[PDB]
Amino acid sequence: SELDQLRQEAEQLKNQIRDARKACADATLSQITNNIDPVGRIQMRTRRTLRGHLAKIYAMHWGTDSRLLLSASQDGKLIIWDSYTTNKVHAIPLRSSWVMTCAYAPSGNYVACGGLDNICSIYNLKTREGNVRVSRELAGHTGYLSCCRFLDDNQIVTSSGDTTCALWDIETGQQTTTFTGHTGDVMSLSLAPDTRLFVSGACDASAKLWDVREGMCRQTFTGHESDINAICFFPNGNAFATGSDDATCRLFDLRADQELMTYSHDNIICGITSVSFSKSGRLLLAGYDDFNCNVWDALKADRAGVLAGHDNRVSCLGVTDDGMAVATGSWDSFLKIWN
Amino acid sequence: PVINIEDLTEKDKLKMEVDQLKKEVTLERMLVSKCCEEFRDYVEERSGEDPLVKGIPEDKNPFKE
Amino acid sequence: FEGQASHTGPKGVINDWRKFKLESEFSRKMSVQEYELIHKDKEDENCLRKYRRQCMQDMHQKLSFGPRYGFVYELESGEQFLETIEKEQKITTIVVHIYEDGIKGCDALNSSLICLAAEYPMVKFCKIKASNTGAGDRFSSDVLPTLLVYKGGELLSNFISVTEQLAEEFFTGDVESFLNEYGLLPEK
Ligand SMILES: C/C=C(\C)CC/C=C(\C)CCC=C(C)C
């Protein structure tokens, strides 16, 4: 029980881990791609404008169909839009205006959200008795709900400011598995394409990969010197991108257990809060704290373009599963579709 | 697994930490260069079809005028 | 801004909540006291409305930079081009129009820009003949009319043959719409 010895062993273990990584850190991604011609200047255009919210958009999430999308706003309303016709499919009054995230079930049957209320509310979209009040309210986290992603109609994972992540059984409202490990507020989480694993970023400058079925942490990635605000899984599931306060996006590979590339530039000083890959994973779009968005070239580590021409109006963003569009939310209540 | 955070002690937190670390030390780590090669290959194979990179012809753009 | 995220995502929500309860009334971001407060304070809907409204206005106001221009400035040499994009406030959007008299669109664009510049005095509109850029033979007739948009030394967008993506007979409003659909123009 001697703490000194325990925390000492921890340090030596961490030391052993860093060296192992260094032994494998023989080259950077940029070198491997120094022969790959840069992508053409990415200049996306606004196609659709979603008008409805009465306040700052906090989060948004695309549906599997790459058409219907959800958007949580400061106005205390969750709206399901039809990106194609800018029409509002569902309008859902929330009990709080402070919503940090909003998930969309891969079946389109359910939608979820959470925030400073510390609860992950779930709503039923397809029903004779349509739901706008609530189906379930997953209460348990002793901290704000930062992020949540559906696994199916009955299971959903949620990250929280209480330093924990957790898998819930919607039908019971009970916390099936609790993922403990981070030493600070978990800011984001992202499911692997096969949903058997998922990674999470926290205010401890570390991203952790967890095995949903086993309920334990597989690997812990480090590199950022500040809180990791956003995290997004790569399409092939062998890696993921992170965004933190130190104004750098990092690409971590599972097998390598370390960062393959870092994305930054001397002019960039704002912390990154949103990160999303394109369909091919060639572009790493990053939304910064200054409401700007940079389209990075995942391969060459250089920025391929600017999303929204630096109009200081990007609070959140997300890419469609078919990679046909990027949706952005803003402090002025409007959302835009780009491609 | 089904752990309630606020109830853990400084000790068993470090215990779970060292346990996790021990497990992490035994990780079969792949060479960075190798991983980068595979990453590049995957991307390159699909980059040419990526709508956001190549652009979407107005003809097939779901978000018409 | 500068530093820790406090405008977007979870942290944005946290800070917004704080400002709300301040205007009307490390590893961890929120204090236990603040947590208890959320689970104890009954937020007045009216104050919520006023807050949401005021917040958007504050941003609207912080992004609205004073009218400093109003005319389409002519760049004689490529040097004047480099100097204008570098020696300029990072918050000021610069729209340069590389042109050549007599070329389809070049003239029409210039005309539209005259009024667009008056409509957006916060944006610096500049024009320069391809022959005056001195960039070898990169800005040619097959590229003209080219419209470059800079901001804080960063090249936001480079539009080749901009007019080909506008109506046969366009006006100021058309260029306005086009640039708005790219988030390249500030607000009025
Ligand atoms: C046509 C323009 C508006 C109705 C207001 C501006 C809309 C937005 C700012 C949506 C947020 C998207 C951006 C990245 C700009």
Curated annotation (Swiss-Prot), chain A:
Gene3D superfamilies: YVTN repeat-like/Quinoprotein amine dehydrogenase (2.130.10.10). Phosphorylation at His-265 by NDKB contributes to G protein activation by increasing the high energetic phosphate transfer onto GDP. The keyword Repeat applies. One of its GO terms (molecular function) is signaling receptor complex adaptor activity. The modification Phosphohistidine is found at H265. SUPFAM superfamilies: WD40 repeat-like. GO terms for cellular component: cytoplasm; heterotrimeric G-protein complex; membrane; photoreceptor disc membrane; synapse. The keyword Cell wall biogenesis/degradation does not apply. The modification Phosphoserine is found at S1. WD repeats lie at residues 45-93, 94-139, 140-180, 181-222, 223-266, 267-308, 309-339. Keywords: Acetylation, Phosphoprotein, Repeat, Transducer, WD repeat. CDD domains: WD40. GO terms for biological process: adenylate cyclase-activating dopamine receptor signaling pathway; cell population proliferation; cellular response to catecholamine stimulus; cellular response to prostaglandin E stimulus; G protein-coupled receptor signaling pathway; phospholipase C-activating G protein-coupled receptor signaling pathway; retina development in camera-type eye; sensory perception of taste. The modification N-acetylserine is found at S1. G proteins are composed of 3 units, alpha, beta and gamma. The heterodimer formed by GNB1 and GNG2 interacts with ARHGEF5. The heterodimer formed by GNB1 and GNG2 interacts with GRK2. Forms a complex with GNAO1 and GNG3. Interacts with ARHGEF18 and RASD2. Forms complexes with TAS2R14 and G-proteins; these complexes play a role in the perception of bitterness. Component of the TAS2R14-GNAI1 complex, consisting of TAS2R14, GNAI1, GNB1 and GNG2. Component of the TAS2R14-GNAT3 complex, consisting of TAS2R14, GNAT3, GNB1 and GNG2. Guanine nucleotide-binding proteins (G proteins) are involved as a modulator or transducer in various transmembrane signaling systems. The beta and gamma chains are required for the GTPase activity, for replacement of GDP by GTP, and for G protein-effector interaction.
Swiss-Prot record, chain B:
PROSITE patterns: G_PROTEIN_GAMMA. This is Guanine nucleotide-binding protein G(T) subunit gamma-T1. The keyword RNA-binding does not apply. Pfam families: G-gamma. Gene3D superfamilies: Transducin (heterotrimeric G protein), gamma chain. GO terms for cellular component: heterotrimeric G-protein complex; photoreceptor disc membrane. It is a lipid-anchor. Guanine nucleotide-binding proteins (G proteins) are involved as a modulator or transducer in various transmembrane signaling systems. The beta and gamma chains are required for the GTPase activity, for replacement of GDP by GTP, and for G protein-effector interaction. Belongs to the G protein gamma family. GO terms for biological process: eye photoreceptor cell development; G protein-coupled receptor signaling pathway; phototransduction; protein localization. It comes from Bos taurus (Bovine). Keywords: Cell membrane, Lipoprotein, Membrane, Methylation, Prenylation, Transducer. GO terms for molecular function: G-protein beta-subunit binding. Retinal rod outer segment. G proteins are composed of 3 units, alpha, beta and gamma.
Curated annotation (Swiss-Prot), chain C:
It holds the Pfam family Phosducin. The keyword tRNA-binding does not apply. The modification Phosphoserine is found at S31. GO terms for biological process: regulation of G protein-coupled receptor signaling pathway; visual perception. It is found in: Cytoplasm, Cytosol; Nucleus; Cell projection, Cilium, Photoreceptor outer segment; Photoreceptor inner segment. InterPro entries: Phosducin, Phosducin-like_reg, Phosducin_N_dom_sf, Phosducin_thioredoxin-like_dom, Thioredoxin-like_sf. Residues 1-188 form the Phosducin domain. Keywords: Cell projection, Cilium, Cytoplasm, Nucleus, Phosphoprotein, Sensory transduction, Vision. GO terms for cellular component: cytosol; nucleus; photoreceptor inner segment; photoreceptor outer segment. It comes from the Eukaryota. SUPFAM superfamilies: Thioredoxin-like. Light-induced changes in cyclic nucleotide levels modulate the phosphorylation of this protein by cAMP kinase. Its main location: cytoplasm. Residues 69-188 are annotated as: Thioredoxin fold. Belongs to the phosducin family. Inhibits the transcriptional activation activity of the cone-rod homeobox CRX. May participate in the regulation of visual phototransduction or in the integration of photoreceptor metabolism. Interacts with CRX. Forms a complex with the beta and gamma subunits of the GTP-binding protein, transducin. This is Phosducin.
